[PDB]
Amino acid sequence: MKILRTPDSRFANLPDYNFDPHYLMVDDSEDSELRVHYLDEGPRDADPVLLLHGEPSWCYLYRKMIPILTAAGHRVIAPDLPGFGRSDKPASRTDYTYQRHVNWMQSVLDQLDLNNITLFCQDWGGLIGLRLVAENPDRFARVAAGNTMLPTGDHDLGEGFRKWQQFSQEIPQFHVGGTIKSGTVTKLSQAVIDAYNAPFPDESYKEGARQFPLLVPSTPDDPASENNRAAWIELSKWTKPFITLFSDSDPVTAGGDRIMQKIIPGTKGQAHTTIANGGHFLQEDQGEKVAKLLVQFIHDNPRHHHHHH
């Protein structure tokens, strides 16, 4: 595979974003490697909070959440998926697969040796992140999920998702900022919208953004269907804390918290809530509120341990 790298001038002086870049290389699965950007904030020895973004966002989506988390003493890891943000971007839509995305984020976990993780996931950050939880029980301490899902393809995904999937593929050019506007309930400033467009100087950089909706399992024969069935059987044994923080104004994922509460034992006892005045990209509309709830969630669910452990 071939990769594109967004010029660094694109990332200059973005609103409410001043986080230094970190990088690591991951195997591209085709005999080379590509660069993953991530943020790594907060005390070096603190348990990490892993913030995974999805389609078609990047770690900028988390910028209002990160300072609240680090002020409360948390280490925060916020990676950019290949195809997005400051990460390298495979040049063909066919380069992007569900399994590759899982493997690329697994490599982040492995290289950073993240343990005792609190995951917060949304959109594809949950399609990927919940797979990582299922496949790495011993690395995760807690999970928070908002406006996400984990489809196996055995069921209809519903009105909202079907509309999105169709629109995302029909449009002549993919307007990343347009998608963020459509998935928020706030009149975003143009400089914020421009920050969502920053990774993508032209259409050639958008192949990951264009492929993502096609990778969502919607049939039982999807290449990810069985892996997601297996993930659900692991989640049905997840007894550690699991909270849902879905918002009120996202038809694509509405009600998706109920199946998590039904199936996942570690949801029992947690103070799930519905984030008011929040669209699909609830971190953009309601980042402060969500981050405060995530701080509280960690506080309400201590991990008892010795020093250095």
Binding site for Na ion (CB under 5 A): 261, 267-268
Alpha carbon 144 to chain centroid, angstroms: 11
From the list 47, 80, 123, 285, the catalytic residue is 123
Q: How far is the CB of 251 from Na ion (least distance, A)?
A: 23
Nearer to Na ion by C-beta: 249 or 267? 267
The alpha carbon torsion through 92, 167, 203, 32 (nearest 10 deg) reads -20
Question: Has 123 been annotated as catalytic?
Answer: yes
Instruction: Residue 307: count other Cβ atoms within 10 Å of its Cβ.
Output: 5
Could you say which of Cl ion, Na ion, none residue 175 binds, taking C-beta under 5 to 8 angstroms by partner kind? Cl ion
Q: How far is the CB of 267 from Na ion (least distance, A)?
A: 4
| Residues 179/212, Cβ–Cβ less than 8 Å | no
Q: Which helix (H) or strand (E) holds 44?
A: none
Q: Which helix (H) or strand (E) holds 254?
A: none
Q: How far is the CB of 179 from Cl ion (least distance, A)?
A: 8
What are the start-end ranges of the H helices in the chain? 66-71, 98-112, 124-135, 159-170, 176-182, 190-197, 207-215, 225-235, 256-263, 282-299
Could you say which of Na ion, Cl ion, none residue 212 binds, taking C-beta under 5 to 8 angstroms by partner kind? Cl ion
Using DSSP bridges, classify how beta strands 89-90 and 3-4 pair: parallel, antiparallel or unpaired.
Answer: antiparallel
Nearer to Cl ion by C-beta: 178 or 251? 178
Hey, which residues does 145 pair with through a beta bridge? 121, 244
Binding site residues, Cl ion, CB under 5 A = 55, 175, 177-178, 212-213
Question: Has 47 been annotated as catalytic?
Answer: no
Could you say which of Cl ion, Na ion, none residue 267 binds, taking C-beta under 5 to 8 angstroms by partner kind? Na ion
Nearer to Na ion by C-beta: 239 or 277? 239
Could you say which of Cl ion, Na ion, none residue 178 binds, taking C-beta under 5 to 8 angstroms by partner kind? Cl ion
- What distance separates the 2 farthest-apart alpha carbons in the chain? 56
Nearer to Cl ion by C-beta: 65 or 128? 128
Q: How far is the CB of 144 from Na ion (least distance, A)?
A: 14
From the list 95, 257, 280, 285, the catalytic residue is 280
Active site residues: 123, 250, 280
